[PDB]
Design a protein around this ligand. Structure first.
Ligand SMILES: CCN1CCN(C(=O)N[C@@H](C(=O)N[C@H](C(=O)O)[C@H]2N[C@@H](C(=O)O)C(C)(C)S2)c2ccccc2)C(=O)C1=O
Ligand SMILES: [Cl-]
Length: 520
């Protein structure tokens, strides 16, 4: 004969996308418990109770009997409010209901990496759920119940503490763009028989991350056979050598140096440059001299290396650091990597060249998209955000307007010119960007793999007023080639097209426009 204090569950804060679409919601559920002492006096009600709980008659009876001594045991957790009230309507002595919450994720695996999930005890363990756990959580209340000798609840005596709900959090992500990106990366992953992939979409004016998806993914609503590898928000927490996708930045350093201009011709014959023991190679060996634009179009390692030798590595390091490569994003996503921008006291030729064409440094997809955002935004870099921004934040002019404008023009040519990356063309829009392909690092030794690759494409659109930047990374494609401009480019094409239409961006290239775009 005494008083027990029992918890009152608190509503966990609603997570929404930028426009209010629910991404994580605490849904009301009903838990049924029983006092075996009471149930032992109504044994004749058991078979009906067992059948309403979908449980074997004897196994149910066994459960109650071996707990006859106890005053509390769970019957079933997480019924619907209707299902629980269906069993309560039976009026079985000793059977009680308590209303709890289940965390539900409406978009499931589409946004699992960004949103993350809570555990059995309602604490965030991954993604945004972990990052904003304090904001989201809220605080359970307490109430007192009176129980008799046998443990029968006879009275709800008082509330000693009210439950307070957690706070709503609006993510920067646009769920429409998330669905599109998710589906297209998946399709790409499956078409190409890739092992993994990431896709990031960024608003270049505001810094908001509009979409961030990875493969493999998982269903946070059903984690039964979850494996660790599927949990990774790779766009944020995995690092890679960006390869030729950093060339527009090497190029920006070159134009910033006052030593180079777009018309300058670099001689690249015969597509190799031996420097001591190390040998720089071009995969395209069809041209023997290229202007600055042609170095990007042909993606000449040799061309960019000779430029790098002239301007020096510190020039290139600087722009790369300024556009945030290898730097802290300030996002605070759990597990997020800063990457690495190597810094030697003395820069040999080897390290100077490889940096210039994107090796010996490591970035994340997020960082790469952020760097292209700055270039896309006329050289103004804007702070990354994974929450909705109200005011457009102040930027930092990291590349001059003129140089950014010139490098924009060149990247538009990388996509639109003959010999360029034509699979990256966006119907109805002028797009700009740069493909890349990187040999994966050897497993168990230093060096590069013979037959495993990472396909990259980074870019932005519309060229005439860039609105969004996008990075597509695909690991180990094995079925339809491996080059960036073959694997990742068509994904950029499709997602960029869909994204721009979804955001109502008017088309700037009507010659190539779609069915209804040509009507408006
Ligand atoms: C530091 C040592 N070390 C590390 C490894 N390593 C590379 O893995 N190199 C890349 C490479 O050069 N890729 C090119 C690029 O992106 O520019 C190609 N990508 C295509 C595309 O994006 O479609 C292209 C536009 C047709 S050219 C390569 C070479 C051969 C096959 C696949 C990939 C080096 O080079 C290198 O010296
Ligand atoms: Cl010029």
């Amino acid at each position: 004969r005494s008083v027990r204090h029992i918890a009152i569950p608190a509503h966990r804060g609603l997570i929404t996308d930028r426009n209010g679409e629910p991404l994580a919601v605490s849904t009301p559920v009903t838990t049924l418990w029983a006092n075996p002492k009471e149930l032992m006096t109504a044994k004749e009600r058991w078979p009906q109770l067992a059948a309403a709980l979908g449980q074997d008659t004897k196994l149910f009876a066994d459960r109650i009997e071996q707990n006859a001594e106890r005053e509390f045991i769970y019957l079933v957790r997480g019924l619907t409010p209707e299902q629980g009230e269906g069993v309560i309507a039976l009026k079985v002595p000793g059977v009680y209901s308590i209303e709890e919450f289940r965390r539900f994720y409406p978009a499931g695996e589409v946004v699992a990496h960004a949103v993350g999930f809570t555990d059995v005890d309602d604490r965030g363990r991954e993604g945004i759920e972990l990052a904003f756990d304090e904001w989201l959580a809220g605080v359970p209340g307490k109430r007192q119940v009176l129980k008799d000798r046998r443990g029968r609840v006879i009275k709800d005596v008082q509330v000693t503490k009210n439950a307070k709900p957690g706070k709503t959090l609006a993510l920067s992500i646009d769920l429409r763009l998330q669905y599109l990106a998710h589906r297209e990366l998946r399709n790409a992953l499956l078409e190409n028989g890739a092992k993994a992939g990431s896709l990031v979409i960024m608003d270049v004016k505001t810094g908001e991350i509009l979409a961030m998806t990875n493969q493999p993914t998982y269903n946070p609503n059903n984690r039964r056979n979850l494996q660790p590898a599927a949990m990774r928000n790779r766009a944020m927490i995995d690092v890679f050598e960006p390869g030729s996708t950093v060339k527009p930045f090497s190029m920006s350093a070159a134009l910033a140096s006052g030593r180079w201009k777009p018309s300058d011709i670099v001689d690249v014959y015969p597509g190799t440059l031996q420097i001591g023991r190390y040998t720089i190679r071009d995969v395209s060996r069809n041209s023997r001299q290229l202007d600055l634009t042609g170095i990007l179009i042909k993606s000449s390692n040799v061309g960019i290396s000779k430029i790098a030798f002239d301007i020096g590595a510190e020039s290139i390091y600087s722009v790369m650091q300024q556009v945030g490569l290898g730097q802290d994003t300030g996002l605070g996503f759990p597990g997020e990597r800063v990457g690495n921008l190597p810094n030697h006291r003395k820069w040999p030729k080897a390290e100077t060249a490889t940096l210039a064409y994107g090796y010996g440094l490591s970035v994340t997809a997020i960082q790469l998209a952020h760097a292209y955002a700055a270039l896309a935004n006329d050289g103004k870099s804007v702070p990354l955000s994974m929450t909705r921004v109200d005011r457009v934040p102040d930027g930092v002019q990291v590349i001059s307007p003129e140089v950014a404008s010139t490098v924009q023009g060149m990247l538009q040519q990388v996509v639109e010119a003959q010999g360029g990356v034509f699979r990256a063309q966006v119907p109805g829009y002028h797009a700009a960007g740069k493909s890349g392909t990187a040999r994966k690092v050897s497993v168990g030794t230093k060096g590069y793999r013979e037959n495993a690759y990472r396909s990259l494409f980074a870019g932005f659109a519309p060229a005439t007023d860039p609105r969004i930047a996008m990075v597509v990374v695909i690991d180990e494609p094995s079925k339809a080639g491996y080059f960036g401009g073959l694997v990742s480019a068509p994904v950029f094409s499709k997602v960029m097209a869909g994204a721009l239409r979804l955001m109502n961006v008017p088309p700037d290239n009507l010659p190539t426009a779609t069915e209804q775009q040509q009507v408006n």
